[PDB]
Symmetry: C4
Subunit: 333 residues, 4 copies
Amino acid sequence: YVSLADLERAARDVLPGEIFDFLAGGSGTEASLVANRTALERVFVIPRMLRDLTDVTTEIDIFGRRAALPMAVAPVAYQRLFHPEGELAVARAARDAGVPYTICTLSSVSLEEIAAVGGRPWFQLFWLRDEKRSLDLVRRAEDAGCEAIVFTVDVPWMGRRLRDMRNGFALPEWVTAANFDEFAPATWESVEAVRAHTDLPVVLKGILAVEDARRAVDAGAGGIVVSNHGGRQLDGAVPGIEMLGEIVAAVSGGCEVLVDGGIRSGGDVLKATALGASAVLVGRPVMWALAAAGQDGVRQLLELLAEEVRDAMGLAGCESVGAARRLNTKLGV
Amino acid sequence: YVSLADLERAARDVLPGEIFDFLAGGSGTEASLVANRTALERVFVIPRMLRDLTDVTTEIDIFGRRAALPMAVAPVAYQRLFHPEGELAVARAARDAGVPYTICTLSSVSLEEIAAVGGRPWFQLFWLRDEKRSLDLVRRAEDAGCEAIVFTVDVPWMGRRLRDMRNGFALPEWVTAANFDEFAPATWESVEAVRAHTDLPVVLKGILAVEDARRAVDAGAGGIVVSNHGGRQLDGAVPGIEMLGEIVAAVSGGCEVLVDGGIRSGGDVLKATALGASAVLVGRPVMWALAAAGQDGVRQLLELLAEEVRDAMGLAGCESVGAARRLNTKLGV
Amino acid sequence: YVSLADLERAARDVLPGEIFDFLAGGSGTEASLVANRTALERVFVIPRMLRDLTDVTTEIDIFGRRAALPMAVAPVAYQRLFHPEGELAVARAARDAGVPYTICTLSSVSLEEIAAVGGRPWFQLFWLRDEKRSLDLVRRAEDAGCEAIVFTVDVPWMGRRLRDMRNGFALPEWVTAANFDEFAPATWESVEAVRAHTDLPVVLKGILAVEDARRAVDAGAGGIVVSNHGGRQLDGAVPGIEMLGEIVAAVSGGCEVLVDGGIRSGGDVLKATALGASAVLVGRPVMWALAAAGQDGVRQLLELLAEEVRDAMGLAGCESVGAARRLNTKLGV
Amino acid sequence: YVSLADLERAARDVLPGEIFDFLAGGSGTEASLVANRTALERVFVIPRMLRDLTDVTTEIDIFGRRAALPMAVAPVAYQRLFHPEGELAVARAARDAGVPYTICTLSSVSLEEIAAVGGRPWFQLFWLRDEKRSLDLVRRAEDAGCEAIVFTVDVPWMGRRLRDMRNGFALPEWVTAANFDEFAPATWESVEAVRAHTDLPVVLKGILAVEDARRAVDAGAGGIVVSNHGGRQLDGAVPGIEMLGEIVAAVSGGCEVLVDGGIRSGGDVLKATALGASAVLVGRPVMWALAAAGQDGVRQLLELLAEEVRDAMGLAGCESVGAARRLNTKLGV
Ligand SMILES: Cc1cc2nc3c(=O)[nH]c(=O)nc-3n(C[C@H](O)[C@H](O)[C@H](O)COP(=O)(O)O)c2cc1C
Ligand SMILES: Cc1cc2nc3c(=O)[nH]c(=O)nc-3n(C[C@H](O)[C@H](O)[C@H](O)COP(=O)(O)O)c2cc1C
Ligand SMILES: Cc1cc2nc3c(=O)[nH]c(=O)nc-3n(C[C@H](O)[C@H](O)[C@H](O)COP(=O)(O)O)c2cc1C
Ligand SMILES: Cc1cc2nc3c(=O)[nH]c(=O)nc-3n(C[C@H](O)[C@H](O)[C@H](O)COP(=O)(O)O)c2cc1C
Ligand SMILES: O=C(O)C(O)(O)C(F)(F)c1ccccc1
Ligand SMILES: O=C(O)C(O)(O)C(F)(F)c1ccccc1
Ligand SMILES: O=C(O)C(O)(O)C(F)(F)c1ccccc1
Ligand SMILES: O=C(O)C(O)(O)C(F)(F)c1ccccc1
């Protein structure tokens, strides 16, 4: 594999069509799904030359811990859909690569088991109709050694996935929500309840409006993820990468600002960094690699991404991620 | 049916080619027809998160009455062209859905019969060479219980429909203008004559210039429809959605501002609302549903649109249409 | 024929490939040829409603005489290439339609014969290496009753026509330059020599820079044609329609400002007018009609264009060409 | 051959696929490769009319010597890959055409032999891990009569060429680095070492950031090449032509400013000049001509380019390259 695009084809071959569609699809006409890619492709980097590259490092410090790349594995539900070892395979590879892994509320392996793998586990929270269950999940995650709560705030309910509707897609009975034995819309009061219930940094995932980013900082969030949920929620929602610069300026260092949606290479990581992001999340490509070759597949993906990030940073004259954030960009056609 | 696009294919199958062309076509090279869609697709919404969605409502108050959605059925002539029950089928479905239905001057069922169906009938007026006939139509409409006069102002004469010319399209003899037993260009004097002759709100349909919107308010119009007539009049006329924001700002609450042209989903409705529209008109899709399955087809269309509007509003953090109008947007590529 | 596009296909059928290529082609990669169309298609008109249309007129006064449309036939060399009757057929149709016809320096019928047809003949001048021959042509044109000298200023030499080079295209021996029994670059001194030698208005064709338009007025030109020569001279030259607005503003009524390049409908004429043009030139479509059906073909073309111009003007609320020049426009995608 | 595009097809036929890919390809997804062309195609020239063209000259003075065109042959490694005579064939043709030829550090014929050909040889330098070898190359080049040192500054290491990786491309054993019997990242200290070691003008190739251009002048560079290395280094790097205008303004005559990337015609040369460039480099097309017909092929290419430059300049009203730099441009779609 010399690019992430190699993996998608491999995954399409092995996966049942209905499952590949669940993974690949977006909501409505998939306008926001496509726009995530279009938006990245319009961004060009202005590289710097002739700087010291004797010790190029791709490492960052985030939420108290060192990470090997400015990157984490995005929360993706029911990973046993893509491979028998599911979340355990991905978590093991992420651990080995020094990249944070985000355990899902809807993981098909329990959060305690995934956390036992080690590494840098974060935990993604969906707000539940029974609030006490949501706060219990948070407590479970913290007890199991998760380092951050990624509170998903753009899913008051699931978007309308036309591929899934057309396929009549449903969870195979061999895939379950292992954390349970349903959703409620989250509000700012929900965020406060979570913040008061944990010492872990709370990260609001799915922020797109500048004033929501400001309010996130005021609410005590340790980070936000600028995101339209991979084009899977509001169809017609602006791509996060189009809002990123404005949001980074507005929060003015008040919290970590992550972005996701369409990151498909080290060059894309460089673009996000240059626009001001602390780090990116990567979703579908990690699942392509999992589907294609299990744990070893994800390992290969992360090794490829690591080399592409180092390459891009050096070619752009950046010895550190901090330097990459000070790069300028130019919009193209 | 999970999208409006499902309906168009169904309608293409059942309709004679010449009739589908009458419905689908625009004037000239159909530049303005295509531009209505292109313009909507360039608009992206910036959604808000973490707001109270306990009582999401899609209802609006317009021209004195509550409507179930920020939407009305656009005036479309000769609906018996598409289905034997014609206007009666559409009006019944609209009534049941709580959506205003616009009775046409050129309806293939008399306006009194359509009005007898009940619901929220509006009446669309074409100015006639004999002025007295036009004012008589207005009186008939008011007597029959219509709630608004939609005065079409962008048809001094019909545009050049090249599909119709090439097909040699003509009304089948089983389709007639049931309100009669011809056009004259309307002027601002015509508007005043109508306004003086009725207590009903007068709505000017086909406004695109900012100063025409201003003058509409000065002329005592209760509303305007920002519209290039679905690309069927001036070929090269700007899409209404491109003028909407500027017009909403200029009239500064002085009348209702509706828009139409290319609305094909709840997400499109959200975009129009976010740009400032009070409500939208939907034309061709209603006729697709009518052609495909008569009254039940239109019912299904309106139910689908209702769910898509609620979904879009909630995902964008809007508990009311008023909230949706305060959303910001961003132009994309 | 219901559009100009109908004619092009007809002409492609009947013409030898090499001759159709001479007519259709541009210089270099034909970037400027394509850009003339792209530029027009990006322009949208903001129409006005509810104005008096009782006496819509498409007539203009230009260079002392009334014309039936804001349009003239562009100079096109060697018209016997396209039809046996060549320039005589086109001139007769133009006369009958009340549209000025531009006699070429390189006409395949003598300028005296074409002028004898009557109507509103203009004469297009190429500057010749022997200056006295050029001034003699001007005198001949004036004596024969031509009403304007269209001095072509963007051909110091002919551009590189790759279609012609690839075809090894050459004039058939049955086609000659009937005004003769060669080119020199024109300068501002050449313009002055022409102006001093005639009482006719001098029109500089091929102006694209704003300061060249200013200087044209200072030099005593009665008009200019904003033009990149139909994409046949400098490949990469900006389309005239993209410079038109700026040029109209700069000359501030000091001379007539015409435009050409890609005018293919009445709607296109409306766009040019709305951008400030006094009138347009139409080139290739007139030759399509000539090739397709001789004099009657051109007559049909001009009748179609006349109806399209009236239609567009009325639908845009313009009772006169002057009103059309006060229309606003909006750039689209 | 009537255009450079003719040559590429000829070269594709004769070259082994792996070698054509080495020549044609870029890094990553080849976004920057494509963008070089897209960026040029968006630029339109505003030509001037009616100026004196009695002595049109395409000559420039650069780095102390007259050149026949505002153009030099770009450094391209291992030219024996494309033709048995390799660099000698290209250098001979360039000499005959009065165009500077850039001898590569990785030439497949020694720099002394290529320099012996005569003409205007420049020498391109890659910084070596052993610094003394790099300074020795500089001394060798100066002793052999090279007139400028083109220090490549955008290759701390080679970019990721996915075509090459997929092909498993490697140098055939009959092709060697003839200057040797490896790379180190260059810094501003390296530039200073070179500048102190030679009296020749030092030209920094691969500058894209405005402040790097400023610093180049401060560092004593005699020129820069605004360049993203033909899309072969950082994938996503902005095209040089998009940065050119801003850079020309910032250096304010302090050094020569060259540009490369996608120059494929005399018209493209005119565009670069109009944006402010002193001269352009041309890379891949020279190799197409070499592959297609050896020395005579390159001669034909340079003759074609010379005619296209003269043509473009004259049609734009420019009697000199200096005049061409004062042309205005307009961005299109
Ligand atoms: C199949 C699938 C399942 C997902 N499940 C969740 C989830 O449970 N919670 C969440 O916050 N985001 C979820 N996401 C969104 C991702 O976290 C992330 O925002 C998005 O996938 C990133 O875009 P990318 O896939 O283009 O890299 C899911 C995405 C996909 C494709
Ligand atoms: C077949 C057809 C007939 C129409 N008849 C009328 C009419 O009689 N009066 C009128 O004001 N608008 C008429 N319209 C325009 C619609 O009211 C409306 O402006 C347009 O269709 C909305 O665009 P949409 O079809 O993309 O939703 C007609 C449109 C179509 C397609
Ligand atoms: C075949 C052909 C011959 C032309 N000959 C002349 C000419 O002799 N003198 C001149 O000023 N323009 C000449 N033109 C340019 C036209 O006058 C005019 O600028 C251009 O054709 C208008 O663009 P259009 O063809 O898209 O309408 C010629 C154009 C064509 C296509
Ligand atoms: C096959 C190939 C080899 C190249 N080798 C070098 C090189 O050794 N040193 C260098 O500075 N640039 C090198 N370049 C880049 C060119 O000097 C130049 O920047 C680029 O090719 C210009 O773009 P163009 O090919 O579109 O004209 C090479 C380019 C190609 C295609
Ligand atoms: O986008 C997703 O797939 C999600 O995991 O965030 C979800 F919660 F919306 C979802 C959607 C469908 C099935 C399961 C979970
Ligand atoms: O756009 C229409 O179809 C119209 O109903 O508004 C009309 F009046 F222009 C028309 C056009 C053709 C046939 C009937 C009515
Ligand atoms: O663009 C033309 O075809 C022209 O008529 O203006 C011309 F003079 F450049 C020309 C070009 C080729 C053959 C004859 C005349
Ligand atoms: O871009 C090139 O091909 C280069 O010559 O500049 C190089 F040095 F990067 C290179 C790349 C691959 C093989 C040899 C040289």
